[PDB]
Amino acid sequence: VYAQEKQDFVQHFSQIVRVLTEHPEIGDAIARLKEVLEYNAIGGKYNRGLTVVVAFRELVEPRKQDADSLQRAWTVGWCVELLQAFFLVADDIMDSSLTRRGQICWYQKPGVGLDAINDANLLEACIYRLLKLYCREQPYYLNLIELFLQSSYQTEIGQTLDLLTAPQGNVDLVRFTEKRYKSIVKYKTAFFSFYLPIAAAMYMAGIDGEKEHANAKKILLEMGEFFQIQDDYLDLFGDPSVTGKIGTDIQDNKCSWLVVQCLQRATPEQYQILKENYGQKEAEKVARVKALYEELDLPAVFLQYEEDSYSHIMALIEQYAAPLPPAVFLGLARKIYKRRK
Amino acid sequence: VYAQEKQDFVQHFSQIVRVLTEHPEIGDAIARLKEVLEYNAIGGKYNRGLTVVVAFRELVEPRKQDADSLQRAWTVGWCVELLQAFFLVADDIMDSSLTRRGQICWYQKPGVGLDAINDANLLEACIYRLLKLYCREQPYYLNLIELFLQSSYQTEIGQTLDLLTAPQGNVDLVRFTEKRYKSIVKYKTAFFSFYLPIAAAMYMAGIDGEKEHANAKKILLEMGEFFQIQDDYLDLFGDPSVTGKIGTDIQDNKCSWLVVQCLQRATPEQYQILKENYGQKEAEKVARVKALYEELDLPAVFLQYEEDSYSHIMALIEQYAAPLPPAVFLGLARKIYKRRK
Ligand SMILES: O=P(O)(O)C(O)(Cc1cccnc1)P(=O)(O)O
Ligand SMILES: O=P(O)(O)C(O)(Cc1cccnc1)P(=O)(O)O
Ligand SMILES: C=C(C)CCOP(=O)(O)OP(=O)(O)O
Ligand SMILES: C=C(C)CCOP(=O)(O)OP(=O)(O)O
Ligand SMILES: [Mg+2]
Ligand SMILES: [Mg+2]
Ligand SMILES: [Mg+2]
Ligand SMILES: [Mg+2]
Ligand SMILES: [Mg+2]
Ligand SMILES: [Mg+2]
């Protein structure tokens, strides 16, 4: 259903750009906004934007799916894609990344640099511009504004947790626990990537109940934790030509799922190898950490976690999906299960 | 009236921090938010926050100024101070600044660096948290959310214009015109610093009329243009112990009011001196540009502009203040007239 809707969803980007780039004095700034939008909102899997589109089709009665209603749905999907673009442009600066989605990071582009900070905020500003342009007269207008605002705050608190546990130049092996990992990942990824697209479609379909949103959240935050674990696995063991980005977690002293599991299985001698080689820019030290991971059979430990966690998410769908069609959660789950990009 | 209300307004910051820093898992992130708030929202003149407080007192009938009403007013004032903090933390990174408000820029602090990007977004997130906590049940709640969102977009478009006209490593003397200057300054400063605090107080007082907001805007955008001109003058000719920040406009190849006037009065020989020495990090080249400014009597040209512009703003107050008390605009105008900090 995602694979089918992909070309239809991407075809609507042209309109999104047209409406956002429509006063001659700000001409150069609006021209730069188009360049920012084209570079940073295109090239990913569009899982978040498509989740809004697919979930709205499954939650709204077909006779109530008019052309204006469907336009609002993929506009809101594109708003989640812009939120993604905002966080990625800033995250690549802060993680000193090289590539994103098969091309050099926007801030690494000659002539951009730290101007990417303001470009990132512009991407965030376009969300509320589109919500005003297409959803201002709708009963769920305020619920969507607050949902996009709260999802941004939650991600930013998660990003604070990610950066505080990963100080440059300091050994922070003590703080790389399972409890700390779950808290980072819940806030930095699980809310905006999984709860936000489904919650937006739910509000657009008139499902605004506290209990329904709490039940959907129980499934989606677990799906999010699992998705970040896959992302951490891919940082080191994924193919950069497929993933589109070069890994930096070891160099960046990140509280990765991999380092958390390494610490749980490592011998005192192996702990010292990790202490001496983690969180440093040296290629030989990064190679040493990877060798330790492969030695502790961490790629196979990931295969077993992925199996066990997927069954747990399936048990959560069975418990908390009702009254929503289970396909809403199953579609996204199958889209991310056994991920390689 | 500003001078009197200053200590009262600053005394409320403790509550603002308490309510924003009130889940044990996010403890370290919330602790970092307090550090960000204390470092970056304190030390300025509080002109924007005080404008909300003073204007709300002058627009609302005293019998309608209850304790809850007054708390909402200085909370909204503090929301404008957080918007200021957000833009300043990011602007200092992008302008490669050293000091702000008498202390080293937050990003220049050891252990902060580019993590300041996420800290800046957290400051922006706190605005909407405070609006939800204190104004969610009020009739002007949505008008304030949209006003803070539109004022952020306008500033960001202004910041895009500021950065596009100031490329590092390129001579952009051709684009340093009066028409381009007016457009940068209108968007980057005039909207959020002058229109936003008065417009917020107007909405809180129930004055939501399009015509009234347009009349107030005509005065306040001119006041804003004037305020940025003073800021550009102070960048080079102000005392860093008084202003609290070290100037970077010449080094940063900025389209400053000073360089616009220099180009309008310079001889072809003087134009070449400017071409060869502007927009470069070399101390001897910056000293050369300053010498040219002093040679063209630019400090005296600023004294005359400040006089003529203040009379024009006074003519605009006389024309467009009604039905609002002129003291609303006069208070802010006298607070910024002959500025040195
Ligand atoms: O794409 P990335 O950089 O692997 C990531 O997933 C990006 C990201 C940005 C913001 C929130 N969550 C994840 P990260 O956490 O840095 O591993
Ligand atoms: O404090 P600054 O850096 O002099 C300034 O006024 C800061 C600022 C930030 C954002 C919008 N407007 C002004 P700038 O424009 O860089 O001269
Ligand atoms: C929140 C995370 C883990 C960042 C990357 O998400 P995606 O893997 O969905 O990246 P894109 O498809 O948008 O490129
Ligand atoms: C928008 C501009 C010109 C930035 C500085 O404003 P202020 O001069 O008001 O600085 P603070 O008092 O908040 O420190
Ligand atoms: Mg990151
Ligand atoms: Mg990253
Ligand atoms: Mg990653
Ligand atoms: Mg600037
Ligand atoms: Mg600056
Ligand atoms: Mg300045």
Side-chain angles (χ1 to χ4, degrees), chain A residues 44-46 48 84 88 100-101 189 192-193 227-228 231 245 339:
Chain A
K45 299 174 289 294
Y46 312 106
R48 291 162 191 83
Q84 166 79 326
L88 294 192
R100 170 75 60 184
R101 293 166 176 171
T189 286
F192 93 95
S193 298
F227 187 79
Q228 189 57 49
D231 180 76
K245 66 201 189 180
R339 212 153 66 86

Side-chain angles (χ1 to χ4, degrees), chain B residues 159-167 169-174:
Chain B
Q159 287 292 76
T160 303
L161 227 52
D162 176 276
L163 302 161
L164 282 175
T165 319
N170 288 268
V171 290
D172 198 48
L173 250 61
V174 165

Side-chain angles (χ1 to χ4, degrees), chain B residues 24-73:
Chain B
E25 50 178 352
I26 56 163
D28 293 358
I30 291 290
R32 170 63 171 240
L33 175 57
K34 181 166 181 178
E35 214 194 342
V36 171
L37 288 163
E38 251 114 63
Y39 201 89
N40 297 291
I42 292 295
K45 299 174 289 294
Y46 312 106
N47 282 339
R48 291 162 191 83
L50 286 166
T51 289
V52 179
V53 171
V54 178
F56 180 88
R57 281 200 192 265
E58 290 170 338
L59 291 166
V60 177
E61 209 197 355
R63 53 166 49 88
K64 286 175 144 178
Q65 285 175 41
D66 56 275
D68 284 351
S69 231
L70 293 162
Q71 178 172 66
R72 284 189 288 272

Side-chain angles (χ1 to χ4, degrees), chain A residues 104-167 169-175:
Chain A
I104 201 166
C105 298
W106 174 245
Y107 87 105
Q108 291 279 19
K109 273 212 97 77
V112 177
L114 298 177
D115 294 353
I117 297 158
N118 187 69
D119 296 327
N121 294 314
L122 270 186
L123 281 161
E124 182 192 25
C126 289
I127 293 157
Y128 303 97
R129 285 192 66 200
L130 292 171
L131 293 176
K132 190 192 174 73
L133 278 158
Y134 291 89
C135 305
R136 70 175 196 272
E137 289 204 313
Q138 297 306 310
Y140 52 78
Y141 179 59
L142 190 51
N143 276 327
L144 293 187
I145 290 174
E146 293 188 337
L147 174 65
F148 276 88
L149 289 169
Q150 190 54 26
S151 302
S152 308
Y153 175 66
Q154 283 161 336
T155 308
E156 281 156 17
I157 275 299
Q159 287 292 76
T160 303
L161 227 52
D162 176 276
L163 302 161
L164 282 175
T165 319
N170 288 268
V171 290
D172 198 48
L173 250 61
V174 165
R175 220 173 295 152

Side-chain angles (χ1 to χ4, degrees), chain A residues 171-183:
Chain A
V171 290
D172 198 48
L173 250 61
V174 165
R175 220 173 295 152
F176 297 162
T177 77
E178 192 62 50
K179 187 173 164 67
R180 164 52 52 109
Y181 182 75
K182 284 173 134 68
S183 311

Side-chain angles (χ1 to χ4, degrees), chain A residues 20 24-30 32-33 86-87 90 93-94 114-119 121-126 128-129 132 136 141-142 145-146 149-150 152-153 155-161 163-164 166 175 179-180 182-183 186-187, chain B residues 20 24-30 32-33 86-87 90 93-94 114-119 121-126 128-129 132 136 141-142 145-146 149-150 152-153 155-161 163-164 166 175 179-180 182-183 186-187:
Chain A
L20 290 170
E25 50 178 352
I26 56 163
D28 293 358
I30 291 290
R32 170 63 171 240
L33 175 57
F86 155 56
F87 286 125
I93 301 163
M94 299 186 282
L114 298 177
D115 294 353
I117 297 158
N118 187 69
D119 296 327
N121 294 314
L122 270 186
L123 281 161
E124 182 192 25
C126 289
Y128 303 97
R129 285 192 66 200
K132 190 192 174 73
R136 70 175 196 272
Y141 179 59
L142 190 51
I145 290 174
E146 293 188 337
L149 289 169
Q150 190 54 26
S152 308
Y153 175 66
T155 308
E156 281 156 17
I157 275 299
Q159 287 292 76
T160 303
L161 227 52
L163 302 161
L164 282 175
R175 220 173 295 152
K179 187 173 164 67
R180 164 52 52 109
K182 284 173 134 68
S183 311
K186 174 191 170 180
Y187 283 89
Chain B
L20 290 170
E25 50 178 352
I26 56 163
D28 293 358
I30 291 290
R32 170 63 171 240
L33 175 57
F86 155 56
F87 286 125
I93 301 163
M94 299 186 282
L114 298 177
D115 294 353
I117 297 158
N118 187 69
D119 296 327
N121 294 314
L122 270 186
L123 281 161
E124 182 192 25
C126 289
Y128 303 97
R129 285 192 66 200
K132 190 192 174 73
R136 70 175 196 272
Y141 179 59
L142 190 51
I145 290 174
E146 293 188 337
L149 289 169
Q150 190 54 26
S152 308
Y153 175 66
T155 308
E156 281 156 17
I157 275 299
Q159 287 292 76
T160 303
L161 227 52
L163 302 161
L164 282 175
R175 220 173 295 152
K179 187 173 164 67
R180 164 52 52 109
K182 284 173 134 68
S183 311
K186 174 191 170 180
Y187 283 89

